[PDB]
Amino acid sequence: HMKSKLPKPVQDLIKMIFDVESMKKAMVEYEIDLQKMPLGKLSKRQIQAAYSILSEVQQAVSQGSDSQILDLSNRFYTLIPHDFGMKKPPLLNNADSVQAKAEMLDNLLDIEVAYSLLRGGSDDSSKDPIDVNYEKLKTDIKVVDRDSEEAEIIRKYVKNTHATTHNAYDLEVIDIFKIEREGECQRYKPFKQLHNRRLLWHGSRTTNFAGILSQGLRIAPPEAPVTGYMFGKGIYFADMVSKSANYCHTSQGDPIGLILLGEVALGNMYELKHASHISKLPKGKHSVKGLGKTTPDPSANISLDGVDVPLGTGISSGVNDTSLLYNEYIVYDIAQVNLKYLLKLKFNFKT
Numbered sequence: 001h002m003k004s005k006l007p008k009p010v011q012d013l014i015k016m017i018f019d020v021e022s023m024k025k026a027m028v029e030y031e032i033d034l035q036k037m038p039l040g041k042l043s044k045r046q047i048q049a050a051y052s053i054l055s056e057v058q059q060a061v062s063q064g065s066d067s068q069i070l071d072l073s074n075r076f077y078t079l080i081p082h083d084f085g086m087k088k089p090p091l092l093n094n095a096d097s098v099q100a101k102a103e104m105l106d107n108l109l110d111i112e113v114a115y116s117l118l119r120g121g122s123d124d125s126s127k128d129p130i131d132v133n134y135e136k137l138k139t140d141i142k143v144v145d146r147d148s149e150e151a152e153i154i155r156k157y158v159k160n161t162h163a164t165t166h167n168a169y170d171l172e173v174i175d176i177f178k179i180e181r182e183g184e185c186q187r188y189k190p191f192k193q194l195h196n197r198r199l200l201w202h203g204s205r206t207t208n209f210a211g212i213l214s215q216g217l218r219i220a221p222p223e224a225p226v227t228g229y230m231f232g233k234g235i236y237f238a239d240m241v242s243k244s245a246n247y248c249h250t251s252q253g254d255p256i257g258l259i260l261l262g263e264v265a266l267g268n269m270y271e272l273k274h275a276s277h278i279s280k281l282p283k284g285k286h287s288v289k290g291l292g293k294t295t296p297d298p299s300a301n302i303s304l305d306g307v308d309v310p311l312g313t314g315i316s317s318g319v320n321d322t323s324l325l326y327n328e329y330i331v332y333d334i335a336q337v338n339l340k341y342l343l344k345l346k347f348n349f350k351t
């Protein structure tokens with residue numbers, strides 16, 4: 001080929017997010033039977049059918065027994081084959097089972113997108129496949145200079161917002177990318193001047209990032225069980241880097257992960273302390289705020305291109321009997337998010 005002219009950090013990003021073996025590894029991490037459901041046989045309609053069966057399992061658990069559940073749990077396993085040999089798989093009979101399988105299905109939806117991009121399209125060995133795959137993301141990706149103002153603010157955000165209760169690891173910022181998904185700016189226009197716009201974190205497994213950059217952050221589909229997500233079917237964000245970093249699902253066997261910083265238009269927040277599996281916001285609300293016991297110190301907010309960055313060190317919020325140690329922010333319209341940066345992080349585990 002010509003050999004790519006992209007900067008090396010951008011090339012390495014493209015390599016990581018389109019790694020087919022990582023996709024396969026994630027599916028084995030989910031107990032999927034790759035002989036019965038190989039990567040190439042995943043389809044939207046099969047994942048969608050699985051989501052529905054999980055919504056039936058949800059409904060049986062809301063209204064309570066193991067006998068009447070068994071049939072439903074089996075139906076889920078029929079649609080998504082799990083590698084249990086000659087078996088009896090584990091009974092899917094509680095809320096935790098429903099959240100875990102809905103999470104798995106979310107991830108399979110993104111793997112399916114990434115693979116479809118790989119298989120869709122043309123084969124030209126005189127082009128560098130890195131260049132070819134970058135183009136399928138329909139996203140401008142630039143390296144942010146480590147010496148800039150915007151690099152310094154981002155690094156401070158990471159330095160200051162690592163929770164003490166997440167101290168099994170720390171984080172080194174490897175590369176900072178500035179990202180512009182095509183059309184996203186136009187989509188965000190109605191919200192661009194909204195009050196309470198904030199620069200927030202969203203972590204995700206590296207196998208999701210081809211789908212995120214190509215399709216943006218999405219809400220779980222109508223078939224998905226609303227009860228699989230603490231504040232229902234929205235797009236979730238944190239103001240503590242370590243709370244979002246936890247969702248990268250890195251480890252000692254793969255310690256490099258990816259995190260997003262998005263401009264999120266929060267407007268009038270619906271403030272909550274416990275699980276609320278809502279389908280819509282109340283009239284007049286634009287988002288949910290999951291109220292943490294700890295918040296970044298409000299007095300250290302700083303501005304980055306007019307957007308507030310809540311990069312203070314963690315202090316008591318004064319909120320009392322809350323299910324959340326840290327804040328969470330949820331929007332329910334995909335248009336309220338404008339992704340701005342992507343960080344490649346290295347996780348130093350101390351265990």
Ligand SMILES: NC(=O)c1cccc2[nH]c(C(=O)N3CC[C@@H](N)C3)nc12
Nearest residue numbers: 103106202203236237238244247328
């Ligand atoms: N992904 C995030 O950064 C995040 C931030 C704050 C709270 C969250 N809650 C979740 C969460 O419910 N997820 C990610 C796995 C997905 N299937 C469910 N993600 C976050």
